[PDB]
Amino acid sequence: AVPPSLRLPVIEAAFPRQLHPYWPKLQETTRTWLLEKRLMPADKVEEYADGLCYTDLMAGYYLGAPDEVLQAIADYSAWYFVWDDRHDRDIVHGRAGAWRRLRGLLHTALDSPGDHLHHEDTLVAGFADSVRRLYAFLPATWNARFARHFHTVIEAYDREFHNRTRGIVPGVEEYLELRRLTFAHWIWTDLLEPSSGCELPDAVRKHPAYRRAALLSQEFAAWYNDLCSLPKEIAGDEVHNLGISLITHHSLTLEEAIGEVRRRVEECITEFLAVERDALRFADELADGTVRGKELSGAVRANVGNMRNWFSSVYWFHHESGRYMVDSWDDRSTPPYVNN
Numbered sequence: 001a002v003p004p005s006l007r008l009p010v011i012e013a014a015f016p017r018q019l020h021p022y023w024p025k026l027q028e029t030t031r032t033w034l035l036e037k038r039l040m041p042a043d044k045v046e047e048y049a050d051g052l053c054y055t056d057l058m059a060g061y062y063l064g065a066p067d068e069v070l071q072a073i074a075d076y077s078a079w080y081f082v083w084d085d086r087h088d089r090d091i092v093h094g095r096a097g098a099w100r101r102l103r104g105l106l107h108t109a110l111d112s113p114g115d116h117l118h119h120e121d122t123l124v125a126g127f128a129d130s131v132r133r134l135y136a137f138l139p140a141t142w143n144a145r146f147a148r149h150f151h152t153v154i155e156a157y158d159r160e161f162h163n164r165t166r167g168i169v170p171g172v173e174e175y176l177e178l179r180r181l182t183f184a185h186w187i188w189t190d191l192l193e194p195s196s197g198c199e200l201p202d203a204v205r206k207h208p209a210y211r212r213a214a215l216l217s218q219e220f221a222a223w224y225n226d227l228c229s230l231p232k233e234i235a236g237d238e239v240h241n242l243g244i245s246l247i248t249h250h251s252l253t254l255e256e257a258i259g260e261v262r263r264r265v266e267e268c269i270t271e272f273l274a275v276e277r278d279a280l281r282f283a284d285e286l287a288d289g290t291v292r293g294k295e296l297s298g299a300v301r302a303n304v305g306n307m308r309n310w311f312s313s314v315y316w317f318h319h320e321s322g323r324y325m326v327d328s329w330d331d332r333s334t335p336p337y338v339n340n
């Protein structure tokens with residue numbers, strides 16, 4: 001049962017949850033990886049890792065992925081959550097120098113992961129290990145696009161460091177543009193392709209129906225996170241959240257901003273439903289009778305199916321994960337799974 005202020009009946013009725021068959025082994029394998037890469041203290045991994053549900057989130061998203069692909073995606077995604085925690089803690093503790101150094105190492109490790117596999121900063125070494133494995137599935141042209149996208153993500157995190165140290169809440173339009181980068185919209189979209197086993201040519205993945213379906217899936221996910229993580233983010237002096245931008249710059253009340261965010265999330269769903277039809281029609285056109293065409297057709301169909309699965313996986317993740325349960329913390333500004 002989902003709280004009424006967070007409930008989306010269309011998701012519950014029309015987007016049935018999916019779970020990848022590898023998820024049991026995925027759960028333990030990623031937890032051991034967090035342990036062995038020293039990405040979180042051992043006692044916090046034991047106490048909190050399974051309850052954070054990071055592997056469940058990815059296992060309900062990239063259906064059909066080969067087990068080894070899903071493992072690399074799950075390790076990268078767990079790393080990404082820890083990086084968000086590190087970013088937050090560097091901000092809270094005014095560690096501008098340590099962040100600047102981290103920011104630079106992640107740029108370098110993204111271009112040359114093998115050089116960073118044993119870096120003294122375990123967060124860098126953990127990133128390099130996951131990126132190394134992601135680079136082993138598709139041609140170097142896909143690797144280059146992943147890197148180009150993630151370079152921008154790192155720099156969007158640096159913009160968040162600038163905003164939060166300076167006490168700046170971005171405007172609504174400014175926030176929406178930045179959120180497509182801090183959420184890594186295009187990274188999750190890139191990773192559809194190794195999950196279906198096919199790098200898509202530019203003419204396919206830029207087709208208007210594919211691009212708009214991919215966008216809507218990510219806008220829903222990011223804004224639903226905003227809706228669900230608003231309580232912890234207000235408690236933690238986070239400034240990056242559509243709700244916070246609305247309260248600050250449009251002088252909405254909390255209740256008004258929650259409603260506005262809800263409506264925007266709801267429209268992503270029904271816009272997606274319409275564009276989903278066009279994207280599946282495109283998949284049908286790709287099946288032109290050739291072997292390449294059937295290949296491309298099946299890949300697009302699988303990818304669009306997983307764009308749909310992102311809606312349900314993100315929805316349920318926010319009600320299962322301990323990441324957001326701010327009411328259970330002794331210090332509402334300091335989550336217990338963060339190294340402070």
Ligand SMILES: CC[N+](CC)(CC)Cc1ccccc1
Nearest residue numbers: 077080081084182183184225
């Ligand atoms: C801050 C963590 N995360 C994912 C690693 C960064 C993009 C956002 C997120 C939250 C909830 C579901 C999916 C992604």
Ligand SMILES: [Mg+2]
Nearest residue numbers: 084085088238
């Ligand atoms: Mg965060």
Ligand SMILES: [Mg+2]
Nearest residue numbers: 084087182240
């Ligand atoms: Mg963040």
Ligand SMILES: [Mg+2]
Nearest residue numbers: 225226229233
């Ligand atoms: Mg959030």
